[PDB]
């Protein structure tokens, strides 16, 4: 909407106070004009019509329990924008400052979040398996990164290309969580998963096997569930990414870590310059090796470590 840029204040899902960029025109709307062509957060009002209504508030204070998922969707979309712009010189998900749209309160008790081809969507959870999913910065950044992939490599969401699509969203979800630097880890969804259980998460990049996901190509899933295992086989690539950053010895193969920033530069370059819609895991290894060669040189430690990591997970 047309109006003037303002700064509201509220609390997120986990009870933390934060400032949010709003727009005033009779009401205060969750419309952040400070980033690209705007960040816009909508209320789906427990229904499944999208996007729903641009979020409107009478006094620019967002401390109601009902407000919390919107505060965090809006704020964490901003953090994710800032990561891509400041770290990768990428302006929004299309590279041309596309408006970022999110809806919260989608459906009733909905234990998930997604990118629907046009916008991010967050359930509230059922309060047992999940609390409102926009409370996890890694979830918000995972979803926005699906939009980045769709505009870049375009990895088809099935089988190995789909498991790479998934791992790219877990990788950059995690690097955005480290960028924001509030309790960062290599786990996915821990801030919003199972409020009655501490220390768990939906997936782990450091040890995918903790939640039944493969950590080696010989354990890949080849059935038809889950679009051919895209949230399962993503563990093989998530483990490779973790080893490139952090190092380790995995099934006897040692990897020298090169740290998160270099992981991000290598996988950002692979995603935007080498991967294609039908890339498989072997092709991802070649893309990552070439990206590391462009950035660091063919005889570099970085190239060696990429090779070691994919060797450690059985991807040639
Ligand atoms: O792939 C998607 O975006 C849809 C499936 N959802 C997830 O992967 C997820 C991640 C973190 C927390 C909750 C759900
Ligand atoms: Ca209010
Ligand atoms: Ca965390
Ligand atoms: Ca995490
Ligand atoms: Ca938990
Ligand atoms: Zn995903």
Swiss-Prot record:
Q: Which reaction does it catalyse?
A: Preferential cleavage: Xaa-|-Leu > Xaa-|-Phe
Provide the E.C. number(s) assigned to this enzyme.
3.4.24.27
- Cofactor(s) listed in the protein's UniProt record: Ca(2+); Zn(2+)
> Top EC class per UniProt?
hydrolase
Name where it's found. Secreted
Q: How does activity depend on temperature?
A: Thermostable.
* Residues annotated for Ca(2+) 1 binding in this entry: 57, 59, 61
Q: Which residues bind Zn(2+)?
A: 142, 146, 166
Q: Which GO terms describe its molecular function?
A: metal ion binding; metalloendopeptidase activity
A single GO cellular-component term on record: extracellular region
What does the note accompanying the cofactor annotation read?
Binds 4 Ca(2+) ions per subunit. Binds 1 zinc ion per subunit.
Q: Which domain of life is it from?
A: Bacteria
What residues does Ca(2+) 2 bind to?
138, 177, 185, 187, 190
Which keywords has UniProt assigned to this entry?
A: Calcium, Hydrolase, Metal-binding, Metalloprotease, Protease, Secreted, Signal, Zinc, Zymogen
A biological process (GO) of this protein is: proteolysis
**Principal place of residence:** secreted
Q: Which residues form the active site?
A: 143, 231 (proton donor)
Protein residues bound to Ca(2+) 3:
177, 183, 185, 190
Where along the chain is Ca(2+) 4 bound? 193-194, 197, 200
Q: What does this protein do?
A: Extracellular zinc metalloprotease.
**Family of this protein:** Belongs to the peptidase M4 family.
Q: Name it.
A: Thermolysin
> What gene does this protein come from?
npr
Fragment boundaries within the full protein? 233 to 548 of 548
């Amino acid at each position: 909407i047309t109006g003037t840029s303002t700064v509201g204040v509220g609390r997120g899902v986990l009870g933390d106070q934060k400032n949010i960029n709003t727009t005033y025109s009779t009401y205060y709307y969750l419309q952040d004009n400070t980033r690209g062509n705007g960040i816009f957060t909508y209320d789906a009002k427990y229904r499944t019509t999208l996007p729903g209504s641009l979020w409107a508030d009478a006094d620019n204070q967002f401390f109601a329990s009902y407000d919390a998922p919107a505060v965090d969707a809006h704020y964490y979309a901003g953090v994710t924008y800032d990561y891509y712009k400041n770290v990768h010189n990428r302006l929004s998900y299309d590279g041309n400052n596309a408006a970022i749209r999110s809806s919260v309160h989608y459906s009733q008790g909905y234990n998930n979040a997604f990118w629907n081809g046009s916008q991010m969507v967050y359930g509230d959870g059922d309060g047992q398996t999940f609390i409102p999913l926009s409370g996890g910065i890694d979830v918000v950044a995972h979803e926005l990164t699906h939009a980045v992939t769709d505009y870049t490599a375009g990895l088809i969401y099935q089988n190995e290309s789909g498991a790479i699509n998934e791992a790219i969203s877990d990788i950059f979800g995690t690097l955005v969580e480290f960028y924001a630097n509030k309790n960062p880890d290599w786990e996915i969804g821990e801030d919003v998963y199972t409020p009655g259980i501490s220390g768990d998460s939906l997936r782990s990049m450091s040890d995918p096997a903790k939640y039944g996901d493969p950590d080696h190509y010989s354990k890949r899933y080849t059935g038809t569930q889950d679009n051919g295992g895209v949230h399962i086989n993503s563990g093989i690539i998530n483990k490779a990414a973790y080893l490139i950053s952090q190092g380790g010895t995995h099934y006897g193969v040692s990897v020298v870590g090169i740290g998160r920033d270099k992981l991000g530069k290598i996988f950002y370059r692979a995603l935007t310059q080498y991967l294609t819609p039908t890339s498989n895991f072997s092709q991802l290894r070649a893309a990552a090796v070439q990206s590391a060669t462009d950035l660091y040189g063919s005889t570099s430690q970085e190239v060696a470590s990429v090779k070691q990591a994919f060797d450690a997970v059985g991807v040639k």
